[PDB]
Design a protein around this ligand. Structure first.
Ligand SMILES: *[C@@H]1O[C@H](CO)[C@@H](O[C@@H]2O[C@H](CO)[C@@H](O[C@@H]3O[C@H](CO[C@H]4O[C@H](CO)[C@@H](O)[C@H](O[C@H]5O[C@H](CO)[C@@H](O)[C@H](O)[C@@H]5O)[C@@H]4O)[C@@H](O)[C@H](O[C@H]4O[C@H](CO)[C@@H](O)[C@H](O)[C@@H]4O[C@H]4O[C@H](CO)[C@@H](O)[C@H](O)[C@@H]4O)[C@@H]3O)[C@H](O)[C@H]2NC(C)=O)[C@H](O)[C@H]1NC(C)=O
Ligand SMILES: *[C@@H]1O[C@H](CO)[C@@H](O[C@@H]2O[C@H](CO)[C@@H](O[C@@H]3O[C@H](CO[C@H]4O[C@H](CO)[C@@H](O)[C@H](O[C@H]5O[C@H](CO)[C@@H](O)[C@H](O)[C@@H]5O)[C@@H]4O)[C@@H](O)[C@H](O[C@H]4O[C@H](CO)[C@@H](O)[C@H](O)[C@@H]4O[C@H]4O[C@H](CO)[C@@H](O)[C@H](O)[C@@H]4O)[C@@H]3O)[C@H](O)[C@H]2NC(C)=O)[C@H](O)[C@H]1NC(C)=O
Ligand SMILES: CC(=O)O[C@@]12CO[C@@H]1C[C@H](O)[C@@]1(C)C(=O)[C@H](O)C3=C(C)[C@@H](OC(=O)[C@H](O)[C@@H](NC(=O)c4ccccc4)c4ccccc4)C[C@@](O)([C@@H](OC(=O)c4ccccc4)[C@H]21)C3(C)C
Ligand SMILES: CC(=O)O[C@@]12CO[C@@H]1C[C@H](O)[C@@]1(C)C(=O)[C@H](O)C3=C(C)[C@@H](OC(=O)[C@H](O)[C@@H](NC(=O)c4ccccc4)c4ccccc4)C[C@@](O)([C@@H](OC(=O)c4ccccc4)[C@H]21)C3(C)C
Ligand SMILES: *[C@@H]1O[C@H](CO)[C@@H](O[C@@H]2O[C@H](CO)[C@@H](O[C@@H]3O[C@H](CO[C@H]4O[C@H](CO)[C@@H](O)[C@H](O)[C@@H]4O)[C@@H](O)[C@H](O)[C@@H]3O)[C@H](O)[C@H]2NC(C)=O)[C@H](O)[C@H]1NC(C)=O
Ligand SMILES: *[C@@H]1O[C@H](CO)[C@@H](O[C@@H]2O[C@H](CO)[C@@H](O[C@@H]3O[C@H](CO[C@H]4O[C@H](CO)[C@@H](O)[C@H](O)[C@@H]4O)[C@@H](O)[C@H](O)[C@@H]3O)[C@H](O)[C@H]2NC(C)=O)[C@H](O)[C@H]1NC(C)=O
Ligand SMILES: *[C@@H]1O[C@H](CO)[C@@H](O[C@@H]2O[C@H](CO)[C@@H](O[C@H]3O[C@H](CO)[C@@H](O)[C@H](O)[C@@H]3O)[C@H](O)[C@H]2NC(C)=O)[C@H](O)[C@H]1NC(C)=O
Ligand SMILES: *[C@@H]1O[C@H](CO)[C@@H](O[C@@H]2O[C@H](CO)[C@@H](O[C@H]3O[C@H](CO)[C@@H](O)[C@H](O)[C@@H]3O)[C@H](O)[C@H]2NC(C)=O)[C@H](O)[C@H]1NC(C)=O
Ligand SMILES: *[C@@H]1O[C@H](CO)[C@@H](O)[C@H](O)[C@H]1NC(C)=O
Ligand SMILES: *[C@@H]1O[C@H](CO)[C@@H](O)[C@H](O)[C@H]1NC(C)=O
Ligand SMILES: *[C@@H]1O[C@H](CO)[C@@H](O)[C@H](O)[C@H]1NC(C)=O
Ligand SMILES: O[C@@H]1[C@@H](O)[C@H](O)OC[C@H]1O
Ligand SMILES: O[C@@H]1[C@@H](O)[C@H](O)OC[C@H]1O
Lengths: 756, 756
């Protein structure tokens, strides 16, 4: 085994550690078992109180778009959607806003963000949308800022899911309900991950989360090399708590804990949900952990270290001197918990405008043949239930946005299904917003929003409506959800039918896709009747009013794709989702570090739309690439430090030191003002190395016609490193490094060589 | 027989008559038959050209809300809806706006307004909504202003339908299509109307239409005393063309003409639609009328008088010196007419705001227990497909708003079905408008707009949503249409179910009814969970934005009911709709003059909501009734004059002279500013006379709290007259007249006696 290292508070939590140790020193064995296992309450999870010492219950609450199952709050855009902005300021402000609302609702610990698990090995991942980029570097940057935004608002974070949690299928949470136990059916999928892949690929974003000060981390459902993540000594005690120097608590996912003793010894700190959800998801600690200590199987001091880890967050964020107000909403639901809900409104001035701005900044133009931007069209047709409201109400699908019937017309896809969803005070529909703009132009506008296959008359309505239209907007979607992967890339609902009808009857079709990921558009993407295609991802509540200004040219589109859009699912990493009824299911990560565009680049597969692709209404020319070797600096700014070994280590040094900076220049060479995401890729020399790896991005805002601006990329030591499996450390390999800059992963007009 | 009197141009058309006679004098027999029978074209009806003399084809076009089947136009509110405003200025401006759009689309003759047929003998009349009030006096005033507004814009009018056209059922238009002829199935319903009833009840509004200068009149489908209206000598040659002194043309309804010779001799002028609609609706004139003249059966001079009547309008409105532009839309439809459509936009600045104002002025508050006006509710539920768009598009139901399937979710009922409908450039939905106001108050709002009986989950969505709501808006409707009467008072669609669910789960339910007439609300109107009830009638395109300001108190509601709302259909005139398969179906108008509230008042039946009932957010006190006998004046202002005989006639005199004026005073005695419709009723002494008869209305706008204003009622000679069947003239009977003033037909705090 790898022994459990003791918390010491590290960099920023030293004083809070000290108060945590003082309190925990006073605790009895019953009290230690109480704080470390869940109890019944209104939140996703609730830690027992330590009543005698005045430590209250902590509310742990979903989710990564804001607190789930609460009224009086805003529905923020999904992580996928903010990734697609490529705007650091928006990644932070989104998180800070979510945090404000978490705090004002009474949440102590936010079950957020998703910071690298699932990272994106398969594009069918039913919950991939909760994360950000299918790229370690960019996911790392988003994860850093998301964590910082949440904690800066006074909410502790529980970053998730550690680690190699890359498929929902056979995730097999522990559950024992009505005589049928998952242990007797099938064990969780095992992620079989080589050491290099674990370091260079899956750990990257978690390192950034630890550096940003995440207070906790949640261990996933999957197994790793046939050992449960939540009792994987190598995972938690070694890689997380030793190499990453993590100082906070490891919280089990809900049914992630499979056992009592291995869990306490191998790095687990908090058993969730404990007595919540009827005890059906395992209840391995609590009174049972009291007996394990008193009879000497589990070390008392070991358990005190778990308590210390939990309380460090409490004191660091000042939840003692500034308590959160009470959490008033039943987010569990009857009959599981019968208990009434109060009411509180926490929506602040500015939040609706921020959510709108994220939408306008993310929406991504994949195809424009000249129909966009719109001028002042006079006869406008609109097709698709995605254009309008859920017919049962925007929250009809319930507490996790997953309970409406398989055929329901859910309206605009504003968030995905599951624990990462949230309620919505309203939906600004695409149709409401297009209609407002139509009225200003004295135009007419009509929408067919029924099911084009199963409602009588819809097809003929469509036939009758489209030919005369100046433009036809088609709104498509693809719902996906926690607990299943998507079967394939197929549009949800009547999507395919809408598109076949649309091109039969209109030669100016503009397609807008609200989705949790990549969809199959192969039948029509090259039809010249589809004059424009845009993906708007998951925009939360301001869906229509964020889209329409971009469509009409008020602001040029500036979003780019945060993953690869291949022409077929066969173009990706093989065995993305393993289906088997084998009792011990296996997923071998044979691809290694080569996921998403790294796979495409290495096998020479040409995607339909590459990673980092997006059109504007203008063009940008790249020039004057400069590598400034003299432009280096100490890492002073992190909240916490890791202990990742590296070759050049000398006591005063860091893996996150900036060792040089790359500069380049962009010129708007088109006819309209626009923003541009500049991207930097490095080819690190070695055996079996990716052709190139994203190591920088910078977004210039609203570059006027003919103007220029400089983009700037700080390069850290780690960014040019490789991990030595033989030596067990990060090193900068000798050799020629290629540095590329440009507008996508495949449009890189500038390059240069750098040698250390 | 009653011989056909010759046109002479009467009062305002004298010079146009002269030019008409000159032109017609030059016409051959072929040319006379061409102008007097319909030909194929893009409009509802088209008169043949007289090519040699440069007289083009005239476009006749539906309908009484504006030109039908046209893009580029606005959907105005229905006549029912403007009646409910009780605002003369709005009745005029609505008509003038409709006229502008008629003209700018190229229409020569508008098939509008509905000016007393159907007037409202039965509240089940499928097309009652096209007219205004179920009251001769008020229908007369609306009819005068509607006609004036249309002609003032340069469009000739064809006022309809003459006369005693009081049920759609067995209207039996002539049609002979695919070997099956209506003549071999069933004759039109016969209206058996006594002479007093015809004069005091059905003729009243047509007299006002003739006085306002209607250029034509359309004869109805029904028979009168077992003679078709369109060949009823007594109807057309005598009552219309002699007593009413009508100087314009009688146009057949479409399939209203049953014969060639009786029609030419008994007063018909224009055979419509002629060769249009495949000749299937009879084609009795045209080439056949050429042979009838040349072989001497039909007098040539008689036919010249028809031509003269048609051309008088053309010259009077200046359609020669200012031609209408071309009519560019196929309003017939393929396969009946295959022909392409151009495009023109005629929507002017100001029209959308006028249609909104009519909505805000008409919406009628029937019940308010204190829930209205709304303050700033934070959780708002909305129920009903009426709250949102037609799922197939607002115009999906086609050229006459009547072709969507029996179950379709048609969305907000903005106009009724049939030839009196029109297309809509958009629908401002109740839900869009409530949502905008919710957003301003930082509130949440959710709508269940599916079918609550047949869509899975809707009922539970409803159960789950309503209890927590501060207010629940329920939107109900009742579509009806030309060519059928309503079976009963039942809400359309899932109405009944919505209301049962609403009161189970909310104690603050506010009901809004969009309808073509009275509906059965008896199950819930007295439930204290229904805290407010409003009828909004048919608001055209600005449905939501006209309603919401009234709901939120920006303006107090000031509409009142234009018909009686009885508790059951058994409370009305019996035999309202006769159903039979008898070849010659009969309707005996045994009730005489006693329709609508005259029936209720006479039989001592207490309606649920009386004629002229509506609540405000304030109250008004009535005081200081004055009859000013000295306040009389000559009738100088009419466009045309009738020749109605009357006892006091002396050459310089008129039946429309004002013989006194009634004044009264209203004081706003509540807490909020509001508008008030003041109503005047006279009890004319006689045998079998109504208890009281509306003879005045005046609307005070925005009366501040504690302020007073005077309402003024001019009383004409005709207004205190009766018709002598023995003498065949109007007379003022000797005796005591009761004069009542107040806020409804049953809330009349002021009264006084007047003797001639
Ligand atoms: C899930 O399972 C996979 C299953 O394999 C696990 O992965 C393994 O992870 C361990 C670390 O826990 C690796 O152990 C290290 O192995 C080094 C030798 O590697 C070479 O030999 C092995 C065995 O014959 C091969 O498998 C390797 O091949 C792979 O890597 C190469 C190189 O890139 C590729 O080309 C191959 O194709 C494979 O991908 C190698 O050829 C070994 O040197 C290393 O030794 C040090 O580290 C430990 C500390 O843990 C010390 O105890 C030991 O004393 C050595 O440390 C001293 O020495 C160095 C100097 O040499 C100093 O710098 C130190 O500070 C110190 O004083 C270590 O044992 C194993 O190789 C790796 N396998 C693969 C295939 O990746 C996952 O960890 C497992 N995960 C979980 C979560 O359970
Ligand atoms: C659909 O059918 C109904 C079926 O009846 C038709 O109605 C009738 O309409 C005609 C007019 O075209 C009426 O004719 C007039 O009758 C007068 C006599 O009426 C009394 O007797 C008759 C017959 O016995 C009764 O039916 C009447 O009863 C009804 O009215 C009374 C009174 O209120 C009620 O109490 C009853 O219960 C009934 O409702 C009466 O008791 C008759 O005097 C009148 O005579 C003059 O008019 C014509 C001009 O058309 C002259 O030719 C004639 O010379 C008289 O005119 C001179 O005399 C007067 C002075 O007396 C002068 O002032 C004149 O200027 C002139 O020099 C006339 O014949 C008939 O009564 C009426 N029936 C009913 C039941 O209403 C509908 O018209 C028909 N409609 C259509 C469209 O086809
Ligand atoms: C299994 C699971 O994930 O359950 C939890 C409760 O904590 C878990 C975390 C999860 O995020 C949470 C909160 C969610 O938010 C999910 O979005 C969520 C799910 C993914 C879903 O999960 C499932 O459908 C399970 O696969 C499903 N499992 C089974 O039917 C099953 C039974 C025996 C052996 C193996 C499987 C299940 C359905 C309904 C109740 C319990 C279990 C249950 C669950 O009801 C929700 O489940 C419960 O609320 C619940 C669980 C146990 C008892 C009572 C209630 C779900 C929702 C909200 C729909
Ligand atoms: C019967 C009738 O009212 O037809 C007209 C055409 O001029 C009439 C006036 C009417 O206002 C007009 C324009 C309308 O606008 C109506 O809203 C309207 C109707 C009320 C409707 O009328 C009916 O449904 C008839 O009762 C119906 N009648 C019969 O089926 C019938 C056949 C034989 C004997 C007795 C009855 C019918 C349906 C479809 C085509 C022709 C007749 C036809 C009609 O298609 C529309 O009809 C046609 O367009 C049409 C008529 C004949 C031949 C070809 C087309 C209708 C619409 C638009 C739906
Ligand atoms: C509107 O949103 C709805 C949710 O709020 C969407 O419904 C969900 O959609 C997904 C598919 O996209 C379904 O997931 C699959 O469903 C089945 C499992 O169903 C049952 O099968 C057996 C029963 O014998 C049993 O094993 C299961 O427990 C289920 O009872 C499988 O095909 C897949 O494995 C996968 O889980 C959801 O089931 C469905 N939810 C519900 C509650 O029906 C809906 O698709 C949205 N509308 C549109 C157009 O996208
Ligand atoms: C949405 O608006 C729709 C129209 O655009 C509404 O559909 C119409 O609604 C009325 C009833 O409210 C129906 O009128 C009745 O229908 C039938 C006649 O149907 C057939 O019966 C025989 C066939 O064997 C034949 O004689 C007829 O020609 C018909 O084929 C009778 O019950 C009545 O006499 C009456 O005419 C319309 O038929 C219906 N239109 C269509 C095209 O189906 C719809 O109701 C609206 N939705 C809601 C919720 O109100
Ligand atoms: C272990 O955890 C238990 C569950 O959290 C804990 O119990 C709970 O104690 C809290 C206070 O710490 C109580 O909360 C409220 O109760 C009283 C009235 O009874 C109020 O005056 C207070 O304001 C307070 O809000 C809970 O009632 C109680 N919950 C349950 C389910 O019993 C135990 O105390 C913990 N045990 C140890 C050893 O600390
Ligand atoms: C009786 O009515 C007929 C139908 O309206 C009428 O015919 C039509 O005549 C018009 C002009 O009055 C023609 O309109 C266009 O034709 C020529 C080109 O062919 C253009 O140069 C002109 O600009 C004009 O717009 C119609 O083509 C014609 N319609 C049909 C169906 O024949 C007869 O002329 C009328 N008969 C009499 C005796 O007047
Ligand atoms: C310690 O406690 C656990 C849980 O009750 C029990 O299974 C185990 O056998 C105990 N050890 C001894 C030595 O009794
Ligand atoms: C494009 O639309 C036109 C109608 O606008 C249609 O006739 C043509 O077949 C369509 N083209 C394709 C490739 O579907
Ligand atoms: C009114 O609503 C309440 C719930 O708000 C319900 O319990 C009660 O039965 C309802 N009353 C009626 C008369 O339906
Ligand atoms: O937040 C948790 C989610 O990430 C996990 O997968 O399911 C349990 C949830 O409550
Ligand atoms: O306008 C006409 C309408 O009033 C009549 O009833 O049907 C024929 C229509 O075209």
């Amino acid at each position: 085994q790898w022994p459990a290292p003791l918390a010491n508070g590290g960099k920023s939590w030293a004083s809070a550690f000290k108060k945590a140790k003082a309190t925990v020193t006073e605790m009895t064995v019953e009290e230690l078992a109480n704080i470390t296992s869940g109890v019944i309450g209104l939140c996703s999870g609730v830690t027992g109180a330590v009543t005698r010492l005045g430590i209250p219950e902590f509310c742990l609450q979903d989710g990564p778009i804001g607190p789930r199952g609460v009224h009086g709050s805003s529905q923020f855009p999904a992580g996928l959607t903010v990734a697609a902005t490529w705007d650091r300021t928006l990644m932070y402000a989104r998180a800070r806003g979510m945090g404000q609302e978490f705090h004002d609702q009474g949440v102590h610990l936010a079950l957020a963000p998703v910071t690298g698990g699932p990272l994106g090995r398969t594009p069918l991942n039913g919950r991939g949308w909760e994360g950000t980029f299918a790229d370690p570097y960019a996911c790392g940057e988003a994860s850093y800022l998301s964590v910082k935004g949440l904690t800066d608002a006074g909410v502790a974070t529980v970053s998730k899911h550690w680690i190699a949690y890359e498929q929902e299928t056979s995730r097999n949470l522990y559950i024992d309900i009505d005589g049928v136990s998952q242990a007797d059916i099938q064990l969780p999928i095992s992620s079989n991950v080589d050491d290099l892949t674990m370091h260079e690929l899956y750990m990257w974003s978690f390192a950034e989360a630890v550096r940003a000060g995440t207070n906790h981390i949640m261990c996933s459902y999957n197994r790793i090399n046939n050992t449960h993540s939540c009792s994987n000594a190598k995972g938690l005690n070694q890689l997380l708590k030793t190499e990453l120097n993590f100082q906070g608590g490891v919280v089990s996912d809900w049914g992630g804990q499979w056992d009592s003793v291995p869990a306490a010894e191998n790095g687990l700190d908090v058993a969730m949900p404990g007595k919540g959800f009827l005890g059906a998801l395992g209840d391995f600690w609590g009174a049972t952990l009291v007996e394990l200590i008193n009879n000497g199987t589990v070390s008392e001091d070991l358990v005190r270290d778990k308590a210390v880890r939990i309380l460090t967050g409490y004191y660091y964020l000042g939840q003692d001197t500034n308590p959160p107000p009470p959490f008033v909403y039943n987010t569990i639901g009857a009959p599981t918990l019968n208990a009434t809900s109060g009411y509180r409104n926490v929506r602040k001035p500015g939040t609706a405008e921020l959510i709108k701005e994220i939408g306008s900044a993310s929406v991504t133009l994949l195809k424009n043949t000249g129909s966009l931007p719109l001028k002042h069209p006079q006869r406008i047709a609109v097709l698709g239930n995605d254009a309008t409201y859920n017919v049962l109400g925007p929250n009809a699908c319930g507490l996790a946005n997953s309970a409406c019937d398989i055929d329901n017309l859910n309206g605009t896809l504003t968030t995905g299904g599951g624990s990462g969803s949230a309620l919505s005070p309203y939906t600004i529909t695409p149709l409401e917003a297009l209609q407002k703009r139509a009225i200003e132009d004295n135009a007419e506008i009509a929408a067919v929003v029924a099911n084009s296959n199963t409602t009588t008359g819809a097809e003929d309505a469509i036939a009758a409506l489209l030919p005369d239209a100046d433009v036809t907007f088609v709104f498509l979607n693809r719902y996906s959800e926690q607990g299943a992967d998507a079967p394939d890339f197929s549009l949800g609902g009547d999507g395919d039918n809408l598109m076949d009808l649309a091109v039969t009857y209109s030669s100016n079709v503009v397609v807008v896709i609200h989705t949790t990921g990549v969809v199959d558009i192969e039948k029509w993407a090259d039809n010249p009747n589809v004059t424009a295609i845009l993906v708007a991802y998951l925009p939360g509540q301001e869906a229509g009013n964020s889209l329409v200004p971009v469509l009409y040219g008020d602001v040029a589109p500036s979003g780019k794709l945060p993953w690869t859009w291949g022409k077929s699912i066969d173009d990706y990493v093989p065995n993305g989702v393993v289906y088997t009824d084998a009792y011990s299911p296996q997923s071998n990560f044979t691809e290694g570090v080569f996921i998403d565009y790294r796979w495409f680049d290495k096998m020479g597969i040409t995607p339909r739309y590459e990673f980092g692709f997006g059109l504007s209404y203008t063009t940008f020319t790249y020039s004057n690439l400069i590598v400034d070797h003299g432009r280096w600096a100490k890492d002073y700014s992190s909240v916490m430090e890791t202990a990742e070994p590296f070759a050049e280590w000398d006591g005063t040094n860091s893996l996150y030191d900036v060792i040089f900076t790359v500069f380049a220049t962009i010129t708007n060479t088109g006819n309209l003002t626009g923003s541009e995401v500049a991207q930097l890729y490095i080819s690190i020399p070695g055996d079996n190395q990716p052709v190139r790896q994203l190591r920088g991005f910078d977004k210039i805002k609203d570059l006027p016609v003919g103007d220029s601006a400089v983009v700037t990329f700080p390069i850290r030591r780690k960014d040019v490193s490789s991990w030595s499996v033989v030596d067990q450390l990060w090193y900068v390999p000798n050799g020629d490094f290629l540095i590329s800059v440009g507008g996508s992963s495949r449009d890189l007009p500038l390059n240069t060589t750098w040698t250390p």
